Design an enzyme around this catalytic site. Structure first.
Site, PDB file in Angstrom:
ATOM      1  N   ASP A  25       0.831  -1.241   0.000  1.00  0.00           N
ATOM      2  CA  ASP A  25       0.000   0.000   0.000  1.00  0.00           C
ATOM      3  C   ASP A  25       0.857   1.279   0.000  1.00  0.00           C
ATOM      4  OD1 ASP A  25       1.031   0.164   2.707  1.00  0.00           O
ATOM      5  OD2 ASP A  25      -0.869  -0.492   3.585  1.00  0.00           O
TER       6      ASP A  25
ATOM      7  N   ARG B 253       1.152   6.821   0.183  1.00  0.00           N
ATOM      8  CA  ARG B 253       0.391   5.869   0.968  1.00  0.00           C
ATOM      9  C   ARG B 253      -1.019   5.838   0.351  1.00  0.00           C
ATOM     10  NH1 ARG B 253      -2.474   2.688   3.452  1.00  0.00           N
ATOM     11  NH2 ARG B 253      -2.111   1.829   5.509  1.00  0.00           N
TER      12      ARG B 253
ATOM     13  N   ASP C 234      -5.400  -1.068   4.022  1.00  0.00           N
ATOM     14  CA  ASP C 234      -4.264  -1.563   4.803  1.00  0.00           C
ATOM     15  C   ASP C 234      -3.925  -2.936   4.247  1.00  0.00           C
ATOM     16  OD1 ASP C 234      -2.273  -1.317   6.846  1.00  0.00           O
ATOM     17  OD2 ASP C 234      -3.564  -2.322   8.207  1.00  0.00           O
ATOM     18  N   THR C 235      -2.765  -3.002   3.693  1.00  0.00           N
ATOM     19  CA  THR C 235      -2.143  -4.310   3.428  1.00  0.00           C
ATOM     20  C   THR C 235      -1.341  -4.844   4.600  1.00  0.00           C
ATOM     21  OG1 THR C 235      -0.302  -3.121   2.245  1.00  0.00           O
ATOM     22  CG2 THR C 235      -2.138  -4.035   0.844  1.00  0.00           C
TER      23      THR C 235
ATOM     24  N   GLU D  37       1.972  -6.030   6.443  1.00  0.00           N
ATOM     25  CA  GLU D  37       3.367  -5.632   6.275  1.00  0.00           C
ATOM     26  C   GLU D  37       4.039  -6.825   5.606  1.00  0.00           C
ATOM     27  OE1 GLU D  37       4.579  -2.512   7.076  1.00  0.00           O
ATOM     28  OE2 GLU D  37       2.486  -1.909   7.705  1.00  0.00           O
TER      29      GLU D  37
ATOM     30  N   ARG E 171       4.219  11.404   3.727  1.00  0.00           N
ATOM     31  CA  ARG E 171       3.736  10.578   2.580  1.00  0.00           C
ATOM     32  C   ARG E 171       2.512  11.231   1.957  1.00  0.00           C
ATOM     33  NH1 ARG E 171       3.155   4.723   5.365  1.00  0.00           N
ATOM     34  NH2 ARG E 171       1.627   6.024   6.452  1.00  0.00           N
TER      35      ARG E 171
HETATM   36  C1  LIG Z   1      -3.755   5.579   5.284  1.00  0.00           C
HETATM   37  C2  LIG Z   1      -3.398   6.670   6.283  1.00  0.00           C
HETATM   38  C3  LIG Z   1      -2.425   6.449   7.267  1.00  0.00           C
HETATM   39  N1  LIG Z   1      -2.120   7.419   8.178  1.00  0.00           N
HETATM   40  C4  LIG Z   1      -1.158   7.206   9.263  1.00  0.00           C
HETATM   41  C5  LIG Z   1      -1.885   6.620  10.466  1.00  0.00           C
HETATM   42  C6  LIG Z   1      -0.887   5.638  11.043  1.00  0.00           C
HETATM   43  O1  LIG Z   1      -0.184   6.242  12.191  1.00  0.00           O
HETATM   44  P1  LIG Z   1       0.820   5.374  13.067  1.00  0.00           P
HETATM   45  O2  LIG Z   1       2.064   5.103  12.246  1.00  0.00           O
HETATM   46  O3  LIG Z   1       0.975   6.340  14.198  1.00  0.00           O
HETATM   47  O4  LIG Z   1       0.186   4.071  13.462  1.00  0.00           O
HETATM   48  C7  LIG Z   1       0.004   5.265   9.846  1.00  0.00           C
HETATM   49  C8  LIG Z   1      -0.394   3.936   9.186  1.00  0.00           C
HETATM   50  O5  LIG Z   1       0.297   3.734   7.952  1.00  0.00           O
HETATM   51  P2  LIG Z   1       0.973   2.295   7.640  1.00  0.00           P
HETATM   52  O6  LIG Z   1      -0.194   1.327   7.560  1.00  0.00           O
HETATM   53  O7  LIG Z   1       1.708   2.559   6.369  1.00  0.00           O
HETATM   54  O8  LIG Z   1       1.895   1.961   8.786  1.00  0.00           O
HETATM   55  O9  LIG Z   1      -0.144   6.275   8.892  1.00  0.00           O
HETATM   56  C9  LIG Z   1      -2.736   8.682   8.105  1.00  0.00           C
HETATM   57  O10 LIG Z   1      -2.427   9.541   8.996  1.00  0.00           O
HETATM   58  N2  LIG Z   1      -3.671   8.932   7.181  1.00  0.00           N
HETATM   59  C10 LIG Z   1      -4.050   7.995   6.270  1.00  0.00           C
HETATM   60  O11 LIG Z   1      -4.904   8.276   5.407  1.00  0.00           O
HETATM   61 CA   LIG Z   2       0.268  -1.390   5.951  1.00  0.00          CA
END
Ligand SMILES: Cc1cn([C@H]2C[C@H](OP(=O)(O)O)[C@@H](COP(=O)(O)O)O2)c(=O)[nH]c1=O
Ligand SMILES: [Ca+2]
Length: 129
Positions: free
Chosen positions: A15, A29, A34-35, A37, A75
């Site tokens: 993702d 992103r 959510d994929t 890891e 991102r």
């Molecule tokens: C998809 C997405 C993720 N995020 C943030 C929330 C998560 O915070 P935390 O890292 O604090 O858990 C993280 C999850 O992305 P990943 O699934 O790439 O790790 O990215 C956003 O803020 N907005 C979004 O639209």
């Molecule tokens: Ca992920």
């Protein structure tokens, strides 16, 4: 919402993807998904699947939603299309991603993706097997 041009720099995982957007490299992103890891079950298949989709594309496009365009890590947040087909949707349709991280304001394609999750789940695909 509007589609904008971009070019693949490199596939990263299920993702996230590195694209050149307005001529600058950035990590994108995928919105609303959510994929697993890479280290988790279906993570390698989710990575392979997104990778194939974006590497085989002639035309990559990015589509911002109405809300935040950058997360706290810098991102880009977008819907990404490969030859007109949404990667975010396809990841969900194949059972390689769950609908996730649905924040008000950045959720235009929620319904569409939930519909794909339902079909994936009915078929018992991948994550739902
Ligand atoms: C998809 C997405 C993720 N995020 C943030 C929330 C998560 O915070 P935390 O890292 O604090 O858990 C993280 C999850 O992305 P990943 O699934 O790439 O790790 O990215 C956003 O803020 N907005 C979004 O639209
Ligand atoms: Ca992920």
């Amino acid at each position: 919402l509007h589609k904008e041009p971009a070019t693949l720099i490199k596939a990263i995982d299920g993702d996230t993807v590195k694209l050149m957007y307005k001529g600058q490299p950035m990590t994108f992103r995928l919105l609303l998904v959510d994929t697993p890891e890479f280290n988790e079950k279906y993570g390698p298949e989710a990575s392979a699947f997104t990778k194939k989709m974006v590497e085989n594309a002639k035309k990559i496009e990015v589509e911002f939603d109405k809300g935040q365009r950058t997360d706290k890590y810098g991102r880009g947040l977008a819907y990404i299309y490969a030859d007109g087909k949404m990667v975010n949707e396809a990841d969900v349709r194949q059972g390689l991603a769950k609908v996730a991280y649905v924040y008000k304001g950045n959720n235009t394609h929620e319904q569409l993706l939930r519909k794909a999750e339902a079909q994936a789940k009915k078929e018992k695909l991948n994550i739902w097997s």
